[PDB]
Amino acid sequence: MKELIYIEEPKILFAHGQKCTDARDGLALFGPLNNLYGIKSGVIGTKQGLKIFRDYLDHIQKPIYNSNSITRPMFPGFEAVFDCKWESTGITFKEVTNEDIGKFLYNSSTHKRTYDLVSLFIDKIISANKNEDENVDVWFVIVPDEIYKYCRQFHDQFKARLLKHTIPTQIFRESTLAWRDFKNAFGLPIRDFSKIEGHLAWTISTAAFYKAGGKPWKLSDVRNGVCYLGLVYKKVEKSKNPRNACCAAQMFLDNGDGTVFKGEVGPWYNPKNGQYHLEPKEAKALLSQSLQSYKEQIGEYPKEVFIHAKTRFNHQEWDAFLEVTPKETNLVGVTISKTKPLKLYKTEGDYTILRGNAYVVNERSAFLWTVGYVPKIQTALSMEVPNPLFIEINKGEADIKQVLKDILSLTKLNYNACIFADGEPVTLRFADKIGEILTASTDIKTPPLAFKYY
RNA sequence: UGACGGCUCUAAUCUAUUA
DNA sequence: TAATAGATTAGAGCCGTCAAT
């Protein structure tokens, strides 16, 4: 019989310094940190798509209710939550006819049709950006449920191509905004959101508010002078080789004041297939870039660098890392994995193990429960029994207690969603996202480096 | 491309041995 | 220059998310 420890739930700081635990309740109670005066929407799509976006924008001005107000809080309305304006008066329609889509979708090759479709969309968007006097804050691409159905490659190539211009954008489908009318031939909706309409409104509003330059919440208590790196490896499929290792990183310092979260990127390439390791030159380049990007914004080098990863580091890349690291900087390499098939069971009956319990195997290895039961919403984050994260300190010296605490803290800032907390640290998740986007088109110089473009 | 969770399925690499 | 094999990694496609069957 072994023992479990408990890690206290982290706090996210809302407006006028009001700590809370749930992002939705903190927003519905206090509001986002900074105020946008309003959101100007540029909608590109068919006429039906324009009508769908219009009626959804008119719908989410009014309050939206979930089936149970405890498991999922109800949505008060966009202006109430965010003290902004995101309404149908600011729509700047750029029509795309259906015949133009048909001229491209009905070819043979999948690469050609996807390329032509992305070309039409991005060319219209770029023409609107360059030579129109409007100031569109976020572009909204309403794609019918006939484009993304047979284009898989649409989204990643889209975002990769629009990178040189830095235009925030957001993709929607009419099934997402008009699930009610997009039933099947049987007469039953395929995407039933009747009991979770408020949750969908929360997610959409949060994503759109962040893509327009608003910061909804931030970490409450994280010590200063410590930086975090999330390194992920992807496969460059369109290269000559079947696989080619691509390292993309997401950096997370706290700030001089608060909530800096950028992503130290510019993909580092390892040509040897299957070897998810960084050559000494690329390792030195990555660490130097991250250190400089911390330094010129803060002023002094970080006192602790926590290089998270889903892979174990070997010796060569590690000594490469310490080659470019200053003496005063503590450097730690943590490995987070979901491989271990451990599954605890609450013997008392219906519900699962409370989220936040750990199992310290030793000094340099522990299990953590990021997914579990949450008393505040009176329901677990998963349906089946949750899986733990095997957090093992691959390299360096660090307190496993503090490592688990920080890994549980970094699971809160998933700005792309409005959920209680993420099941993985957000550095790894966002590094994965921007690495997936940056490898779609292999010709980019100095990518934008800000998450609203990915 | 609303966002996650959980699933299965498909691969490749390293360490070893047996040529 | 081929086989099994533990351990370590990635990529891909899919269903559920209420209450009650």
In whole angstroms, how far apart are CA A163 and each of A346, A434, A452?
A: 48, 11, 11
- Beta-strand relationship, A138-143 and A169-173: parallel
Residue type, A211: K
Q: Using an 8 Å Cβ cutoff, are A120 and A105 in contact?
A: no
Expressed in Å, this structure's resolution amounts to: 2.8
Nucleotide closest to residue A426 (CA–C1'): B4
Give CA–CA dist A248/A265, Å, rounded.
6
Residue spans of beta strands (DSSP E) within A363-428: 365-368, 373-374, 379-380, 389-395
| Distance (Å, whole) CA A284 – CA A310 | 20
Is position A150 annotated in a ligand binding site? no
- DSSP structure string for A222-262: --SSEEEEEEEEEE-TTSSSS--EEEEEEEEE--SSS----
Give nearest nucleotide to A179 (CA–C1').
B2
Q: Which two tokens stand for residue A109?
A: 């090759």
Q: Determination technique for this PDB entry?
A: cryo-EM
Strand C at less than 7 A from CB of A19: no
CA distance A365 to A394: 9
- Hey, what are A5's tokens? 């420890």
C-beta within 7 A of nucleic chain B, residues 343-402 of A: 371, 381-384, 386-387
SS3 call for A398 = coil
DSSP A353: P
Reduced to 3 states (helix: H, G, I; strand: E, B; else coil), residue A403 is helix
